[PDB]
Ligand binder design. Structure first.
Ligand code: 23Y
Ligand code: 23Y
Length: 40
């Protein structure tokens, strides 16, 4: 069982923007979408 202790480390203090944290990794590769109409 993992338990994370939080003591010092603020990600937002005085800045008007929704801050992006250091974990950004989504699965992307194939995106299917064939148009059947003009050029087949
Ligand atoms: O000398 C401190 C100067 O601070 C500035 O404001 C600030 C004071 C403090 C934070 C104050 C803090 C205080 C007590 C405490 O226990 C913990 C944190 C921090 C500021 C600004 O921006 C940092 C910030 C904000 C958003 C982020 O996404 C990332 C960083 C923040 C920051 C956070 C942090 O984890 C570590 C830092 O060294 C700084 C003021 O504008 C100045 O006037 C002042 O002189
Ligand atoms: O090389 C860039 C080419 O861009 C194309 O337009 C685009 C390529 C891509 C994105 C490409 C992408 C690629 C790799 C990758 O790992 C991730 C994302 C996207 C486009 C256009 O608009 C989407 C958009 C833009 C602003 C927003 O606020 C919201 C959406 C964006 C979009 C983002 C997304 O998270 C998921 C999507 O399906 C689409 C043009 O049609 C091409 O001509 C051009 O060659």
């Amino acid at each position: 069982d993992a338990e994370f202790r939080h003591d010092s480390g603020y990600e937002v203090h005085h800045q008007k923007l929704v801050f992006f944290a250091e974990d950004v990794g989504s699965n992307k590769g194939a995106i299917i979408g064939l148009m059947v109409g003009g050029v087949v």
